[PDB]
Ligand binder design. Structure first.
Ligand SMILES: Nc1ncnc2c1ncn2[C@@H]1O[C@H](COP(=O)(O)OP(=O)(O)O)[C@@H](O)[C@H]1O
Ligand SMILES: Nc1ncnc2c1ncn2[C@@H]1O[C@H](COP(=O)(O)OP(=O)(O)O)[C@@H](O)[C@H]1O
Ligand SMILES: Nc1ncnc2c1ncn2[C@@H]1O[C@H](COP(=O)(O)OP(=O)(O)O)[C@@H](O)[C@H]1O
Ligand code: BEF
Ligand code: BEF
Ligand code: BEF
Ligand SMILES: [Mg+2]
Ligand SMILES: [Mg+2]
Ligand SMILES: [Mg+2]
Lengths: 372, 372, 372
């Protein structure tokens, strides 16, 4: 087959499509949903498991399980359904033709990458495949060969410093604070204004609140004082069922978890200090070009004001001698997939696939030598 | 001063009394009752609206309104009647003398705590007051500095991990399943044997069936098989009017809702998995002491067999390499009030009251900085 | 006078006790711990900051800060707590009466030794003190007067050639590779089996995995091939909370960092080439007697098999004409402290103390002329 698929099966929201396109062919929630009520209508297409946009649409009668937790596949029985849906339902291409570029977060369990390779060769029969790292693909989308990626998906936030083509694996920082945990924190603080959301169906409404209204404050303490001179920062959101909810300092006190992880009680650097600590693990001659080439990526980097709050805080930690030149491109909602759509299309990369003939003499253990 | 009041105004049943006593001075249903019928006997001590034990006694002619719903006050014009009845009709002390310890569930709406504080300083003029969390009070009655409190009242079930006197707010759980919804579910399943209860007056009779006859099965399917070798589990309850109702397996299929919330259709973990999911959100080194000091509280944990059913299920979820122990003292029906009666008595606590002299220069917003 | 203290203020784990005793009186983690959660249990011995074994025990609610980083005191406001705790809590002796032998790594910053001297004379008022080198103390514990000391603690690894009483400061080596960076790497490889240790308390669990289960392979690639006949090398450890983790090639691939620092991405010789380079920088006639008397020291030299891997590697680098006889004594967990407990006892050492009556006519600058 001439064309590769690239299939960023990432947490919360899969991206999939052919290499050499400039955007994903399909994007849908990485959700398998199962009925939670007594079926009664005989004579109907009643179905035992919905997946993707079917599960997102019918959700008022479903329990929703994401099969991926913090970038690790935790429910293979349902992860086969998400890949099966991805290839047979709306890409609608037989995997026996197209080789496929998958993608993984850095510092994942080796057992995940093995079992992921096995399913692709033994349930889908793809002629060849590869497992690039979510950060390394982002520099191809930016057109760079040096930078520090901050990638922050639904399930994981991570940094991978890269200089003039080489990744620095001792300086990789992985943090499990991401777009999911902000959604659970928003379900928690909305309780203190009197709105209760608790079902896995209602968590999707709280995700739509988070996406439509949140922003990152340029200076959180001054913003908290500004919300006490109240009603200038408040917004209304219109729930399904048409009840409005009004939302105030909890509009920006949600994304500030990224800069102050003690709000969700976990002990870590915020995303500003984790990027700065990663730059400070790099060899001293490269740091000037890492500060000049700091690259945002992944859906959590879409909030209004996050490029400014990030630049403000790295500029406070770094010496005033030199300039942080953060790049937040407008496509960064999909830049990992766009990166894989370049990588799978390179003429030099066609040597690097794991092929069916190279797998079956080596088993799923092959993936650790030929990949990152 | 000789005394302070402590006043657990919780859902379904207020507990009230002076600090330093070893049990509540007054206990009554948190009910306001309004005549639903044509008055005819002119020249009588007739009354516009009853409350507490008056309403509970005269209930056959009253629509009964509980002014607290799921731990949130939702009828302030009648909640002032419950506090007024508490302080003037059977504690019978002028509130202007005594500072008062109120009480609240965790994750309650901030608007509740504000308006509750305002009523206390502006309608009753109390010298000082405070609003402790129902879980934090529960450990003082047990004397422990560490444990996971499970508390389950009429209106709310919640868990609060506490270690070495520090609470973990990121690991708190709240579930809107409690002694009310088990009474509403018991009304429903009794329909299937032939008994119909529908009025807010009759619901108090179903609450007596629940309190007098229910228990938690140690192994639910084995107990359901035991009800097919029938008539060994049946009990007969004598209603007001003297009609007898035999109650069969619904005697234990009611309380089992706590361990399977899908019976009342709500999507959540039961109270066993909610306890274990709270412990699994705590920092790893404390979990051994939380498994050793699981503390029960609130009237819904009074059922026969619930300490054993809980110990069995937590011992199946937790790793078998360590002992799980659950402490369920015999006075746990009042341990939240007993805890407040200790907390208000401490010589080191007398700095922490919100005093009238601090409220009238900061407004009801004061309560969020001095309380939890 | 019966005593002088010897107080090896080392990184990771302070050793302290009176001179002439044969092992440290007190040994505890060099840690200050600060609460990271909301305090609720009023009426308790609730302490603003814990230190040593208190902090190590209560760690599940603390952020743990080691004040000593790579052998440098980086946080004086907390290092004074560790020395105050060391002298007043379990040595429990008035510092105003006992002279104290402190200790330092070779090639430390002068500002470290100055401020360390000032605190002892101006906060604790000690009558006299001295600052020996961690390596120069180690020869007294073995009883040598010639031998290249290799010492490897929590924070620093260094070599100090000594011959017939004289040190060779042009041939001293110091490397920021030690028991800390082995632990920080063990978290980063345990991650690839799926165990997500990340908090400053969970690093203490990973340190126990390191101390309990690690060993140094005699032939690394051959041991990595032996891991393909799997489960023969695996061991399992039971965490706090009772979960069991199995650990495999990541059991010995951790300590191999000492012999291949390129694993953690720094560029240097491994500790075998650091010894052979340090001997090869000595004057040619002493080398035969240095190879014959290589002396090991400090907790990171405790691993099973490290003496054999070292003797193998020096015997490959050094000419086959002569024997290497690496003397690793069995108490080398404490040889730096034991060496000081000899040094402070000698009748010929008592002329060399820096004394309170000499410090206040020269300032902290005295310590650069009267010590090494
Ligand atoms: N406009 C937006 N603003 C902020 N967050 C967004 C926005 N659009 C989507 N998100 C969040 O992005 C997350 C998905 O990010 P994504 O990059 O697709 O994750 P992943 O890389 O792991 O596949 C979800 O939590 C979602 O709510
Ligand atoms: N002996 C009992 N056995 C079973 N249930 C009880 C018992 N006593 C009270 N309850 C139930 O517990 C609830 C009252 O619990 P309570 O602790 O007073 O609630 P709250 O903490 O919110 O004030 C009611 O639903 C009541 O029927
Ligand atoms: N038995 C052991 N096996 C392996 N590592 C050990 C052992 N005992 C101590 N360590 C490690 O050695 C370090 C402490 O060594 P120590 O000699 O006390 O350091 P220092 O000289 O700087 O004071 C810690 O990283 C600890 O985990
Ligand atoms: F899986 Be996404 F990268 F968090
Ligand atoms: F208000 Be009770 F605690 F349910
Ligand atoms: F401070 Be120890 F010597 F690393
Ligand atoms: Mg991603
Ligand atoms: Mg209660
Ligand atoms: Mg040392």
């Amino acid at each position: 087959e001439t064309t590769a698929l690239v299939c960023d099966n990432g947490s919360g929201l899969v991206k999939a499509g052919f290499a050499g396109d400039d955007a994903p062919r399909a994007v849908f929630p990485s959700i398998v949903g199962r009925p939670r009520h007594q079926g009664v209508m005989v004579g109907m297409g009643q179905k035992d498991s919905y997946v993707g946009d079917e599960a997102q649409s019918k959700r008022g009668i479903l329990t929703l399980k994401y099969p991926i937790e913090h970038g690790i596949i935790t429910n293979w029985d349902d992860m086969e359904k998400i890949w099966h849906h991805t290839f047979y339902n709306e890409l609608r291409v037989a995997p026996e033709e197209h080789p496929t570029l998958l993608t993984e977060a850095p510092l994942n369990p080796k057992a995940n990458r093995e079992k992921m390779t096995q399913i692709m060769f033994e349930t889908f029969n793809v002629p060849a495949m590869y497992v690039a790292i979510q950060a390394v693909l982002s520099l191809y989308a930016s057109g760079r060969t040096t930078g520090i990626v901050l990638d922050s998906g639904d399930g994981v936030t991570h940094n991978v410093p890269i200089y003039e083509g080489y990744a620095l694996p001792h300086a990789i920082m992985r943090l499990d604070l991401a777009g999911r945990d902000l959604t659970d924190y928003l379900m928690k603080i909305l309780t203190e204004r009197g709105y209760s959301f608790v079902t896995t169906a209602e968590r999707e409404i709280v995700r739509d609140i988070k996406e439509k209204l949140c922003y990152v404050a340029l200076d959180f303490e001054n913003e908290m004082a500004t919300a006490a001179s109240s009603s200038s920062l408040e917004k209304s959101y219109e729930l399904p069922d048409g009840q409005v909810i009004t939302i105030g300092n909890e509009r920006f006190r949600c994304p500030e978890t990224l800069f102050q992880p003690s709000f969700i009680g976990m002990e870590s650097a915020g995303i500003h200090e984790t990027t700065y600590n990663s730059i400070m693990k790099c060899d001293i001659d490269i740091r000037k070009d890492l500060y000049a080439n700091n690259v945002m990526s992944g859906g959590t980097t879409m909030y209004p004001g996050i490029a400014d709050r990030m630049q403000k805080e790295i500029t406070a930690l770094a010496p005033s001698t030199m300039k942080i030149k953060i790049i937040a491109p407008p496509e960064r909602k999909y830049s990992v997939w766009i990166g894989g759509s370049i990588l799978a299309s390179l003429s030099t990369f066609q040597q690097m696939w794991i092929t069916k003939q190279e797998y079956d003499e080596a088993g799923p253990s092959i993936v650790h030598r030929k990949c990152f």
